[PDB]
Symmetry: C6
């Protein structure tokens, strides 16, 4: 929110200091987006990412990430659904990993709460909930505001508010979005369920395509290129790397 | 609503009780949508599903569903037409089944009442009607609000309000919609009138396709897959499983 | 406008009681639409329908319809035009049919009156004019409101008002519309003038196509399917069934 | 206006007096439109029709029209240009015809006046100008209102206001329009500059087509059909029947 | 702004009096538009036209034009740019032509001034600056108002204001516009830079197309047809007739 | 600003001093735009140009530019990222060049500050920051206003405000824009990531094109033509002339 001018001479003289990535190619202290059609698994993947930064294992094999307290704000799923996802995830975690996640990760369900980042008391409240956290996840942005998502003005105000919170507190904010916003943000990732055409090409049967999703970073400023991943959906929806041959057509 | 934080150790350390589904793949206490072109059979389907959850028999053969009080709010169809739809359904029901349904279903006609969920009087009224119930059916959403249906902001408000009602009271809300409103609903089912192409697919004569409708869940969160069903429309439009053989070419 | 809960047990037990159709496949007590391009004959056909429900003959051969007092509200044609249509229609009516129509049908011209269903005094006034009538015809809806016809919110308010009047009074309301609204209504009929292509297919010369219009019900919930009709336009525009061979191309 | 109910027995029992048409197929006391791309000759056509109804001769050969006082309101063309258009027309008129036209036509220039029919002062002013007249010509509508021309709501208001004026006073209103506004006007005529295709159709050389314009009634309520006319543009743009032979291919 | 009724008998009887054209086919006392993409040379051509009506020479060879005081209001170019264009133009003018232009032409730069014709004090001020002038040039209209250029209502108000000023003062107003408005105006001219395709057709090399622009009148009511001109851009951008052979393809 | 009338005799009678360009083909004291898709290198290019006008060396080889104080306002990138971009650039600079740049460049981070040029506090603040400076860089415009970017009215206001600031203070403003806003800016430059087609054109392998970006001036008023440049992206994204041979087919 308020900054001193850069000390230029000091930025030239001080050693090349590594960018700090909250998520692959996302600079810590900023706002990013996870984008996909409803149902593709954003809520699972975000949960897994949240748990990982909280100190659980890199199950997705996206690479090791700095740890810190995390706050997950699901506003669309009822608590009981969150319990199920957690329990399913839990089967993949050791006793110590589980404990680290429980220490590091706050999940504060907001279904029916009607949170509105443009109202001063919700702004304050989201800002207080970001304080002391390294990551905040909004699942999904649509439930945190009552603006027209296709209006760039109101959306600059909505995103600007998240930017102010991330800038002041150092808590990165990632919002999920059901598939503009994209132009208003600097880091963008996505999920897409395996299509009929992608199925007939990584050599998986059509009746099995529902078990795989592509994950990538479609927008970022900085870092080494991030290769698109395939994930297999295990029980409860838990995502892990998929082992896929790929079809060099004759 | 107002939620305590999730207790994570506790969720890891023991199997939660099974998810409670109000409809196939729809978790209880949430908001879902039923969508189709006007005329495709939403009223009849919803009325049948409402009567099954109220305690009636599983005529649609969608599987056994937990029962509980249902309230059905038709805002487009006059009482006379609702009487016709109910009587036709009635002919499939024994006295006991009729009793079970009447004990569990309230139908509150709303034609001409102009309910507006963005008005505090109607918001409170709908919330009190949801209290203690398992399912509330809004037929159709177009009649419960005076906003622009392709304005995402106002629709987020309308939907937010149903979500508050569902979360405070535990009562699920299904709204029906005549084909943005769907992008941010987590459960979505549809009805689709059998087309000429599909009639040929299932060896049904063209002059007969209007007796057949397809039902499906097109969006839901992870869970047991639910197969697309064909229903036949009997008299008064009552829907029952269709007996159709697949064809090749 | 306000209703008791359905008595369910009574709806099961009471005999299958016939739907009451104000017009073919239109449930009495509701709102419906007659839709077509300007000039296709909506005003004639509506007049003929009005006269018929008032107790005149089924000249269009759409089938016999329950009788009742009718109110026709033309807001677009001057009185003298209405006189001409009436006089022309009159030539097709017996002395007793004429008298029945005059007893049953009120025509209250509204050209230049500026009626607005969203203003409380016009609402009240339309409601009072529906009272005691079985059918009210608005010719055309565009003259009864100052909303954007392509805005679904304002149009839900405009149609909702007609629904409130039809529900309270039992007077069905049919509005004409010059070619949304269609999604906001449950019964929809149309007129379309015979095209060049339809002419070369029911075997009528091109210079004669102007004498025929297709009438159908493009939307309804209930009843036996209503077959599209051709009508011939006689003197003054009066519509009657047309006798058309139809062209099985070789 | 305020109308007595139609007396139905009386309308059945005797032949009404003939419809009174202010223009071919346009009933007197209503609102109609004349439409064309800017430049196609609306001003000249309307001025000629206004001068014929005022009492001038039938140069357009559209048939004899009832006469009565006309008021013509050009809001886009400066007086100098109107003087030019009138003088050119004048050369077709005898002294007697010039007199008849001046007795029956008032032309009130409005360029720069910014008349707004939605403002009470201008609504009253136009209504008083219509009083006792047979025709009022608004050239063009774009200059009599400050609304969006493809906003149906505001345009219904603008048009409603002309309809009130026409019904209270008996004076017909024709507005001209440079090509929603047309969907809800009951009489619509047009002008169309002869195209290359049409030039070939009527054996006119391409370098000459700009001397020819087509006139027609594209919408009207039931009545005697009115054939599309070709006009030739003489000096100053005066329009007169064109002498053109149809061609085949 | 306010007019007496036409004396009809006098318009018939008084001799055929020549229309007074401020610019080719533009009736004096009205509003017109010069339209083109940014960068095509509107500001030069308008300057040249302004200087010509002020009493400088017909360098563009558009035909001789009545003289009168002119006011040029550039709101987009800084003074120093105007000085350069002037100096370059000056090289084409005799000592007497220069003096006539300086006597006749006021240039009042408005860059950064924020003029708004919808504000009463700017309206008054533009009206006062039109008084005593034969031509006023607004370069470009976009800087004289804060309305939506694609909204026909607000644009009727903006143009209506210019029409009121031109009608009262007899000062014609021409606004430039960077490429609706066109339907709201009766005289329209344009500039278009020579395209790749026009280059390969008037037989000028591609690397030379940047030296030519087409000028025409795309909309007018009155006068002899105005032939499209090619202009060559000389030093400083000064426009003069181009000598172009034209390519009758085999 | 407030301008005296142009003295025309004086402008004709003597050669004005040369135009003063702040950037190639952009007259000093005006507003210009730099446009590209997000990611294409605007921040780096602008930072390099800002450092050159501040007194640094001409690494881009766009020609010698007059120097003067520059203020750079990044509103999207966190300080950490700006430190990285500056350090990378720093590696191309001698101690003296580092000094010259630090003497002439102020960088005021704005992430999360939500500057709004339509608010009087921010309008005044930006104007005082422009005072006495030669260049002000707004990175990007989207963060300096809360209007709709394809609403011409509000954008005319936003741009009008920059033009007032530039004219009152003499400080040029360049805003960057992630690809109406461009139709009414008089100077426009762009960056374009090398495409597959272009890679083939300049014999660069596809897996290498992401190291190359094209820079150009796509709109400016009459003046010396400025050729499109290819830049190579070195570490941290520093841009320098690319050494590329044209290919034929």
């Amino acid at each position: 929110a308020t900054h001193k001018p850069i000390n230029i001479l000091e930025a030239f003289a001080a050693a090349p200091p590594p960018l700090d990535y909250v998520l692959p190619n996302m600079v810590a202290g900023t706002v990013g987006a996870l984008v996909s059609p409803g149902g593709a698994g954003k809520s699972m993947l975000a949960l897994q990412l949240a748990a990982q930064i909280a100190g659980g294992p890199d199950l997705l094999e996206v690479g090791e990430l700095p740890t810190g307290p995390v706050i997950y704000l699901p506003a669309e799923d009822p608590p009981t659904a969150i319990h199920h996802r957690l329990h399913a995830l839990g089967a993949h975690l050791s006793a110590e990993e589980r404990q680290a996640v429980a220490d590091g990760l706050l999940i504060q369900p907001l279904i029916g709460s009607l949170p509105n980042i443009m109202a001063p008391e919700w702004f304050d409240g989201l800002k207080r909930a970001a304080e002391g956290r390294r990551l905040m996840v909004l699942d999904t942005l649509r439930r945190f505001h009552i603006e027209e998502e296709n209006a760039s003005g109101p959306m600059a105000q909505v995103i600007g508010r998240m930017e102010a919170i991330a800038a002041d507190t150092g808590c990165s904010i990632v919002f999920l979005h059901h598939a503009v916003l994209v132009d208003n943000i600097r880091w963008q990732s996505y999920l897409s369920s395996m299509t009929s055409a992608e199925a007939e090409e990584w050599g998986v049967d059509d009746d099995q395509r529902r078990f795989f999703v592509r994950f990538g970073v479609s927008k970022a400023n900085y870092g080494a290129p991030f290769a698109d991943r395939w994930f297999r959906r295990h029980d409860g929806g838990v995502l892990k790397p998929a082992v896929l041959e790929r079809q060099r057509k004759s």
